[PDB]
Amino acid sequence: KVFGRCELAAAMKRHGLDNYRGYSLGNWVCAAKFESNFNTQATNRNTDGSTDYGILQINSRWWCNDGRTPGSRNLCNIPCSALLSSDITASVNCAKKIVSDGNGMNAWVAWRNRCKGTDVQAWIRGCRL
């Protein structure tokens, strides 16, 4: 599924992302936008052979198994293809651990590059949250 901006905001709010680790809803929704343009089935391959899955583009070297990324941990106990679901629950819960890792939202490069230091709050305007 391709989410709307406020649809995803709301479905991220209800999953405990809003203000999680100090990061307002705006951020998360900004990141997804640039990570996957809100597309839940979005995949991208990396140069190191790993593959980013999901609305939040969770990388398989650490967080999920897709069984062709050799020497990878699976720190979210899930098949990577569970990150393509129209039910972002798995993506949420695994992001929540990624964002506790300690580098913060800096993990998602798109966010660090394109959302960090901006009016992230604009990404939740007009949305009945």
Side-chain angles (χ1 to χ4, degrees):
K1 164 176 188 148
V2 178
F3 268 104
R5 172 172 67 87
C6 305
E7 192 180 347
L8 176 60
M12 273 174 165
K13 193 144 180 275
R14 211 199 45 108
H15 273 91
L17 275 192
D18 51 339
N19 284 104
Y20 195 86
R21 287 299 144 139
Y23 291 95
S24 72
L25 216 31
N27 289 275
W28 288 107
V29 178
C30 186
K33 166 71 182 177
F34 295 132
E35 281 302 343
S36 76
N37 190 41
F38 300 149
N39 180 7
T40 43
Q41 295 190 76
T43 55
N44 297 269
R45 190 100 200 235
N46 300 310
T47 66
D48 74 337
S50 76
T51 301
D52 290 352
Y53 301 86
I55 224 163
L56 274 185
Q57 288 293 272
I58 287 176
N59 151 65
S60 84
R61 153 94 39 221
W62 309 102
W63 311 104
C64 63
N65 197 5
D66 59 13
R68 68 138 159 199
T69 316
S72 63
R73 278 267 212 67
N74 186 356
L75 299 195
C76 288
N77 308 327
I78 36 161
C80 292
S81 74
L83 305 174
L84 304 203
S85 167
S86 70
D87 191 302
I88 80 165
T89 300
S91 276
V92 170
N93 297 338
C94 174
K96 286 179 168 161
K97 328 191 163 106
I98 292 175
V99 86
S100 296
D101 215 21
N103 295 261
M105 283 221 50
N106 293 311
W108 301 278
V109 160
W111 176 83
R112 198 193 27 168
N113 273 326
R114 312 179 69 171
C115 298
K116 191 168 185 180
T118 42
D119 200 17
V120 317
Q121 157 256 311
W123 281 97
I124 69 179
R125 302 270 329 240
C127 318
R128 191 162 35 236
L129 301 161

